[PDB]
Each structure stands twice: as structure tokens, then as C-alpha cells.
Amino acid sequence: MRECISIHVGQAGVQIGNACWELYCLEHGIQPDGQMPSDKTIGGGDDSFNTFFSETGAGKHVPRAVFVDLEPTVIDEVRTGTYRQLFHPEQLITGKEDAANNYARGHYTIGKEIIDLVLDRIRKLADQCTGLQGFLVFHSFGGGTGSGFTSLLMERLSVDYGKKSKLEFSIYPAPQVSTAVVEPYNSILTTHTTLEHSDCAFMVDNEAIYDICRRNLDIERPTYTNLNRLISQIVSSITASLRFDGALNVDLTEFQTNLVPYPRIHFPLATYAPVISAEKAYHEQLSVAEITNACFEPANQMVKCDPRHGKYMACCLLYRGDVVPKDVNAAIATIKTKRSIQFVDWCPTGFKVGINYQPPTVVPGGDLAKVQRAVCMLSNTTAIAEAWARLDHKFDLMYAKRAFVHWYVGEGMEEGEFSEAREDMAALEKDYEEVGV
């Protein structure tokens, strides 16, 4: 058994972490006080769930997680939340002033005053690990902390933990739920500085999650609670193979192997179905063929784009619920003849399938309905570059006029880092185009 440490940075990262750990506890049968009756190995063990939870002699199961925000109000809701007993005080780190949606302020100014502390609190966990695989880092692109302090942290972890892997769960900025206007700056900046330090990153466009909540959950205007609960389901699907018995994606290393052939292009597209409303009185349960077919509908993707006009490098199908290999191959064979799925010439056209018989667990009183079977597809398609194009265009528009730039320069940053980062993004867009056409 090898442990994984989850790092939640910024408002988005923290609040999503809460949604996830809440969900994990329900799936593993762990209670708000940290007691897990089914665990008969008291005070320790090396089961699959121990990857995410440590144990105390008192029988408490504690998340191998560290929450960090440059401003206390969000993490304070964790200190006094329903799962307050679950965490340990030194796992929750808060500052006084946030980064005001300013990358430079989160990275250079305020980041410097707290980086050594977080690393120490992270080291406190790693010392409780017999074999650390790496880290799962949750954060936003738009926030000054989630972007600024994250890239700083990622840089250091590659120094203090060179061998260890590092995955990302990144919230991509959407105007519909965003109040900021400078998020394109912060996004390009943190992507540039983090790229060489992240082995695999799962982007989530709030735009996509927002519309899924409107279209399929009949929620007129989703709050963060709506978005986060839906995001936790996707994350849970992706991490399930680390927390449960299986042979597919058993360690963080395998995520890179199976989804990331080229290091720089490490942004797999996630697609999830079915998303069904709990208020849907009468629902006809969907089959393996139907939900698998939905994995190629853009309206179900974490990022809106068109995989048809791109090339795949890898594709994983992660099922939860009543599913067997027979029905999957039947579905794949059928879908193949009807949809456009082009792979790169130097990759085999195939799917790695993972099935967990346990159906998806739902938060009581949540918006999601229980389903007999669900699936999350992880496809590394060049079509996700559209999201970089969108972001880079918004960057160019503002930067040409040097709008807001004075806020960053006033925190010690140089104007040249904007163009350095933008250049790196221009390279990334080109790499995607070499492979994609």
C-alpha cells in the first residue's frame, strides 16, 4: 500500500475538497467522527482506503489532507463544519489577507510568508507514510491563491519530493459564476509555472458544470454547493481506483502511463454520465450502451469542446455500478461504427476499462439521484486545446492594453513574466496542433 496526500488550495480548492472528503466518507462508510466500524484493523493497516486515510489508536480515520487558504473564512467553515472532528488543527492553515485575485500577490508577496509553514505541515503527513506516491492538488485558475500560491507550492514539492508524482484538479474560469475579470491573467501565469511540475491535470470548466446543473438537474442558477457536489462525483470516480481494490490506475504513476504519453500534453478530458435529478419522479434507468454513448456527447464533458475535430492519445472508461465486460465491448463496438474517434498513428485505438461493482454513492439530500450504473471517461484528446485558445485570446485582448498589469507589477512581478508565460502557452497550443492534425 502507498499513501496519497491531498492538498486543497484557495476557496475553490477547499470547498471542493470538502465535497470530496464528504463523499469518500460515505463511500467507505466512515462517519463524521472518523469511526469506521467495518475496519477491523484498529489503529492501523494497509488496505486500499488507507491510501487516503490514516488511523489513530482511538480508531479514528483521518484524511491524509492539508487545507490551505490565505484567508480564513472558508477554512473556518471546515473547522466548525459537520466534519470538524475528522480533521486535525494542523491540517488547516489560514492567513489573514487573501491575494485579491492577484497571482503575483499569492505567489510572491503573501506566498513567501507562509510557504515554509505549509511545507512543514505537509512534511508532518509524509512522515506518517510508509511509501508516499505523491500529491493530489485541488485549486482554481482564477483565484490569486489557487493560482499564485499553488504554482509556488508545486515548484517546491518537486524539490522536496523529486520522485513523487503530482496530479491536479483545476477549476477553469467561467464568467457565469465568476466575479473577477483578471482570471485569464492568473490562469496563464499559473499554468506556465506549474506545467513542468504537474504529471497529470484534470481541468473542470465551471461553464460546463454550470450548464449540466441547469440542463440535467433542473437547477435554475447553480450555487457552488451544486457545482462542488457534482465535481466530487467526478473526482471520486477518478480516485476510486486508488481507494478500492482493482488493477487499473492503482497508483498515481499509472495515471501518467495510461493517459499521458507526451509530458506537456497532460490535460485529459473527463466526461461523466448519467447525471439525473433527484426531483425526477419517474426515471427510466439507462443501460451500459446508453451511458457509454453519452461519454461522446460534448454536453456531458467537463470542458466544452469537439473531440471529433482532434485526435485521441488515450482513453479510459471507469464504470461504477451494475456493469460487466460483455456489455461494454458491445457498446464500444456499436459506438465505434457511428461516431468519429480518430487516434494518433503512434497509439493503439483502444480503451482501458475499469469497473467497480459498487454503484455511485450519493449525498443524502443532494441533487443527484441514485443510479444502477454510471461511468466517467478519461480521454486525452487534442480538442481540449480549445480551452487554451479561449483563455489565451482573452489574455491577449487585455494585455495588449496592459490593463490591470500594474496590480501585478506592484507586487514585485516583472512585465516580462506575462510574455514568458504567454509564449509558453503559444508553444502548448502549437504542440496540440502538431499532434491533432
Binding site: 464568467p175 454536453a299 466544452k304 471529433r308 475535430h309 486545446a385 485558445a389 485570446h393 485582448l397
Partner: protein
Amino acid sequence: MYTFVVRDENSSVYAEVSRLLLATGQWKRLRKDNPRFNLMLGERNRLPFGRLGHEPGLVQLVNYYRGADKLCRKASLVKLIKTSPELSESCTWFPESYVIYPTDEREVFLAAYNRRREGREGNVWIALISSEASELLDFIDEQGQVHVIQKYLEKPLLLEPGHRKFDIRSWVLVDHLYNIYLYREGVLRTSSEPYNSANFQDKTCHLTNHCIQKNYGRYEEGNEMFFEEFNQYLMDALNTTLENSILLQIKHIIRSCLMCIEPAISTKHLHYQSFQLFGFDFMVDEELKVWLIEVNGAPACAQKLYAELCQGIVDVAISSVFPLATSIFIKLHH
């Protein structure tokens, strides 16, 4: 009050459309880089489809189908027909063609070229036109880019008086629902010179382009015979109509081509929508068999039909999506 943008000034067609839209007094034209548009009349090259449908509170539409270039490029069309079972390598309305790169499928072309000559049957091909392979097999290399070789129709239908060659241009509109609308008014882009079997090096007699011709304007005005005349000619000269002898094959080829690529370009469930005007170019042999020559993704209309066609584009492809406060199209059902 809807809004649109224009990013292709050379567009003869949509320049007229942009004017019609303003004349209604219910549309506004923004600037090239204003993202808050309802409609986009985009550029021909590098159109940023990746930035459409990401404006909250704005239904977005564009006059181009992403991926439709696979049908509108000569090298792509051949690959599309040969590779796709829908059309198959045995496709009967497409000339036997082969993709040839400069120094691919060259050895296969020569294999078919031989027994063509070693079988007492006519053998002329086109990229220019020649009866010898090695003649222009070195031509294609001395140009630079990839070309396609295909069987030249040595037995074309010939218009009398004149004993003349011609090609048919049909304008097809595909809306956001992928309804395929054939414009009833097509045009025969004819040659004013008599067709000559003996020498292919001269091309004014073999090529029917609109600009090459400019005996011009002798028989018909501007070397453009419309359906009403061409129909009447067929009835008098061959005792048949245009619908029967030719148009059924045209409606078939059009529908077959677009149905083949529908799953690859359709915007049915997408976050942005597409429509597009196509220009199909057909060729008729002496046995009244229609052959597909090419598909144009950015076609230009004929002067008489600009007003009627462009009004049609607004009716079914734009106002269908953005409604305002006997049809000139034949719908090809499927």
C-alpha cells in the same frame, strides 16, 4: 434586435447577406473582434470555432461547418470516398481518382493505368490533361504541392449548336438542423469553343471555368445557360427533361456526400450552431450520366440569382434560428 460580425470581405455571397440583414432593421453589425455576436460570417482560413458558444446569454451561429473541408478539398474528397463505406471505392458517380504526392498511392495508379491502355479503351487523365502518365507525373513534382490524378471523361455530353463542353453548378444550403436544401436555380457554365479530342494541350476547349473563357457570349450571355433553357434544349434535342435525365443523380450525389459526413460535422447537440452554403460541380457524359467533379466550400453565385439565393439564406438558415417580428429550395429528405 440581433447582432452579427463579418470577417470575410472577399465574400461575394455574404456581402449581400450582410446588407439584407441590415435592411430589415432588426440586425446590427459589430466589429471584427466583438465576441458578443449572435451570428458570425467568418473567414475561410483558420476560423476560430473553438471560441464559439461560450458567451452566456447568446445563441451563436456561424456560416461554416467545422470539418467540412474534408469534402471541399480535392485530396480529401478522394480519401473521403475511398475510405468511407457509404461511398466506397466502387463509387459510380465519381471518376476513378488517385492521390499522388510529389517526391500516397502512385504504384496503384500505374497498375490501373496499364490495363486501361492494354485493353483497347480510351485513356486520358487529369491532375493538366494528357494521355501519357510519365508526361505529367513529373509535372506534379515540379509544382510543389499535392495533387490528384483522375480519369478524364473523354465522352462528354455536347451542346448543339456549337458541339460544346459544359459543367453544372448547384448551390446547396445546409442549416443548423442539417436539413439539406437544394437551390432550384442552377447554372451551366459552358464553353463557347468546340470540344476537341485531338489536342488536350489547348485547354480553352476542355476547361469550363468562369474566368478562363474571359467566342465568349455568343450563344448565351456570359457563357451561362440556366435550367429553363437547358431543360428546353433537352426536351427538343433528346426528348427528355432536366429533372429525369440529370437532376435525380445530382440530388442523389449531394445527399450521399453530406449524409456521409453528417456525424462528423453536425451541430445538433453542440454549444454553437453551424450552417453553410456549398457549390457542387457536376459533369455529364454523352450517356446522360452525372459525375461529381468537386465541392466548393466558399462558392460564388451567379449575378441573376444573387438576390434570390441570398434572401433564401436569411429565410431558412438565419431567421430559422433568430426569428423576426413557394420555397426556392428542394428539400433532400433522409
